[PDB]
């Protein structure tokens, strides 16, 4: 009341179901919870007028460019209205994989080895000196867009000959794009809330990677909480996962994908400041288990709210 909140859901990414399934379902539990809160898509009202509007706070159930890099953060910031996540800088941050990259590996954080190409590079023929570099990486690679989430325009290639094809299809989402030497190790997502971290989520998903399919309309795909992990390379996943994050800026609520190697190590994915929500989402099984309800996550990540 008079505290009117604000879900921004859907909006344009090609993440706007996910989206729309994540305001659903914070929409719920900020209600549950005693909110009064707002279905605002900012695929149809301008989220220019939210001041106009009465809002005193908004919840960003948004996922993607558009939504979860450093633009809408910037308004609401001129604004003067509070949001639940990561501020303007570390929302630009951790929507580049290729920018999250470097700024992890500049502070000497364990990333896996990349690749970057633009479309330019790209619709000129790469140096076949350049695949000199792609090829020192191994077999397989995992190419995938710069700026997506929910494994979108993701293909893995084993083999040089299917890279092209890996190339144009992560292309038509992004113009920079991270080709990545493929991770033979377990699959890792850490969530963060305020300064904690919930317990560690391992998914085995019943395919060859994390596909959008596998996160979200799949049940084969097996989630283990926590990982069942000894408590000292425990101790390393949560200690590599708050670097990891302050070194990116962010804050409120998160959570950072790292995967095992060959080599024994953890390789930081990516992170992501705007998590799912849905009923196969990460963050709310991390939650869970350090037994809260849904509506005490979303709850408690308005407490956030700045
Ligand atoms: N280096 C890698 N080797 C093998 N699989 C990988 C590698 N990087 C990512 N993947 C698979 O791709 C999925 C999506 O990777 P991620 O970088 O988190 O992108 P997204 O924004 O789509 O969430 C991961 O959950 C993992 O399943
Ligand atoms: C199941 C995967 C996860 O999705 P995301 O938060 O992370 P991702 O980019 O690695 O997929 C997603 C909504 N961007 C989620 O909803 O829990
Ligand atoms: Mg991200
Ligand atoms: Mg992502
Ligand atoms: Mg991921």
């Given at each position: 009341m008079t505290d009117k909140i604000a879900v921004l859901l859907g909006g344009t990414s090609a993440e706007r179901e996910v989206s729309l399934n994540s305001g659903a379902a914070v929409l719920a539990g900020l209600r549950e919870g005693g909110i009064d809160a707002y279905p605002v898509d900012p695929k149809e009202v301008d989220v220019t007028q939210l001041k106009s509007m009465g809002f005193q706070k908004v919840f960003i159930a948004l996922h993607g460019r558009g939504g979860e890099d450093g633009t809408l953060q910037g308004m609401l910031e001129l604004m003067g209205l509070p949001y639940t996540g990561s501020g303007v800088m570390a929302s630009a941050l951790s929507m580049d994989k290729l920018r999250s990259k470097l700024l992890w590996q500049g502070a000497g954080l364990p990333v896996a080895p990349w690749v970057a190409l633009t479309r330019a590079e790209f619709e000129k023929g790469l140096s076949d000196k350049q695949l000199a570099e792609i090829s020192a990486l191994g077999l397989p690679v995992i190419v995938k867009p710069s700026r997506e989430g929910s494994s979108v325009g993701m293909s893995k290639v084993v083999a040089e000959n299917a890279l092209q094809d890996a190339l144009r299809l992560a292309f038509q989402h992004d113009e920079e794009v991270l080709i990545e030497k493929w991770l033979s190790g377990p699959e890792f997502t850490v969530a963060i809330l305020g300064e904690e971290i919930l317990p560690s989520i391992r998914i085995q998903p019943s395919?060859?990677?994390?596909?959008y399919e596998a996160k979200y309309l799949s049940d084969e795909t097996q989630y283990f909480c926590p990982a069942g992990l000894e408590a000292s390379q425990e101790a390393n996943l949560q200690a590599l996962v708050l670097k990891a994050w302050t070194t990116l800026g962010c804050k409120g609520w998160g959570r950072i994908d790292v995967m095992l190697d060959s080599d024994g190590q953890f390789y930081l994915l990516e992170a992501n400041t705007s998590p799912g929500m849905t009923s196969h989402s990460l963050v709310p099984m991390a939650a869970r288990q350090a037994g809260m309800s849904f509506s005490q996550l979303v709850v408690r990540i308005l407490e956030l709210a700045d």
């Open positions: 395919g060859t990677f994390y596909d």
